[PDB]
Amino acid sequence: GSAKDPMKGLTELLKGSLEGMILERISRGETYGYEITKYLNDLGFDEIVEGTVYTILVRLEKKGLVEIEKKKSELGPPRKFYTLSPAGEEELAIFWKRWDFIQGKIMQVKG
Amino acid sequence: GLTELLKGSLEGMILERISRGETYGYEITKYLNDLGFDEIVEGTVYTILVRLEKKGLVEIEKKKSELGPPRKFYTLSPAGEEELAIFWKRWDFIQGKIMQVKGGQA
Ligand SMILES: [Cl-]
Ligand SMILES: [Cl-]
């Protein structure tokens, strides 16, 4: 049979989805770049590095979607903790609407 | 405002349309516009198409169309077929995981 694929090479396909995932994770509770990265890796998106997550967090700030608190993490070191602003909450809802639209149309293209 | 989500999905979709029969830029654009993606300009489509050329995923043929006007036609190469199969496998894995996230499960 076919070789068991550990599912790498997802970077390009995750463009557009990545931002939505991060906003979704932030919506659930205050979190930081290292934790967000590990959340995405454990979900199965194994190749996303911390450095990439930082760029997206910067983009989210510029979009006005997140609120930033510097404080000590539970393990010790200071972290930048992100929460959703009301605009972030609304943009997340918009993401799910657009992602649902796109999924349905891709299922038509497959059909 | 679907341009950002379509990035990294549109390549897979265009390869799929090409697999179904020999086609050209204007036709693929119209196919995608009629499907619901009305913000997509032909410039975007041709760029993916040429991106696919430089990756050896498509074979090109300049010839007269059925109606007469000459066009640059696209078919999949052996690499293009394999890439499309990989695309569907990768997309189903990603879709599965995001659906768990949406449902609150992950
Ligand atoms: Cl940090
Ligand atoms: Cl042409």
Numbering used by the authors:
A (entry chain A): -5 to 105
B (entry chain B): 3 to 108
The article reads:
The LftR protein transcriptionally regulates the expression of the lmo0980 gene, which encodes a putative multidrug resistance transporter, LieAB (Listerial importer of ethidium bromide as artificial substrate), and facilitates the export of toxic chemicals from the cytoplasm to the extracellular space. LftR contains 108 residues and is expected to belong to the PadR-2 subfamily. As transcriptional regulators, PadR family members commonly contain a winged helix-turn-helix (wHTH) motif to interact with operator DNA. The apparent molecular weights of both LftR proteins were estimated to be 20–24 kDa, whereas the calculated molecular weights are ~12 kDa, indicating that LftR forms a homodimer in solution regardless of construct designs.
The LftRNtH protein was treated with thrombin protease to remove the N-terminal His6 tag, and the tag-free LftR protein (LftRΔNtH) was used for our molecular studies. As a first step in the understanding of LftR at a molecular level, LftRΔNtH and LftRCtH structures were determined and refined at 2.3 and 2.8 Å resolutions, respectively. Although the LftRΔNtH and the LftRCtH structures belong to different space groups (P3221 and P64, respectively), their overall structures are similar and thus the LftRΔNtH structure will be used to describe the structural features of LftR unless otherwise specified. The asymmetric unit of the LftRΔNtH crystal contains two subunits, namely A (residues from -5 to 105; the six N-terminal residues, from -5 to 0, correspond to additional residues that originate from the cloning vector) and B (residues from 3 to 108), which form a homodimer in an isosceles triangle shape. Each LftR subunit consists of five α-helices (H0-H4) and two β-strands (β1 and β2) with a topology of H0 (residues 4–8)–H1 (residues 11–22)–H2 (residues 27–37)–H3 (residues 44–57)–β1 (residues 60–66)–β2 (residues 70–78)–H4 (residues 80–104). LftR dimerization occurs using 25 residues (buried surface area, ~3380 Å2) from the H0, H1, H2, and H4 helices and the H0-H1 loop through numerous intersubunit interactions. Residues 4–8 form an α-helix (H0 helix) in the LftRΔNtH, whereas the corresponding region of LftRCtH adopts an extended coil structure, indicating the flexible nature of the LftR N-terminal residues. As a result, the inter-wHTH distance of the LftRCtH dimer (~81 Å) is ~11 Å longer than that of the LftRΔNtH dimer (~70 Å). The cavity of the LftRCtH dimer structure (cavity surface, ~277 Å2; internal volume, ~148 Å3) is larger than the cavity of the LftRΔNtH dimer (cavity surface, ~157 Å2; internal volume, ~83 Å3) probably due to conformational changes in the dimerization residues. Upon inclusion, the ethidium bromide molecule makes significant clashes with LftRΔNtH cavity residues (residues 9, 10, 11, 89, 93, 96, 97, 100, 4ʹ, 6ʹ, 7ʹ, 8ʹ, 9ʹ, 11ʹ, 15ʹ, 93ʹ, 97ʹ, and 101ʹ) mainly from the H0, H1, and H4 helices of two subunits.
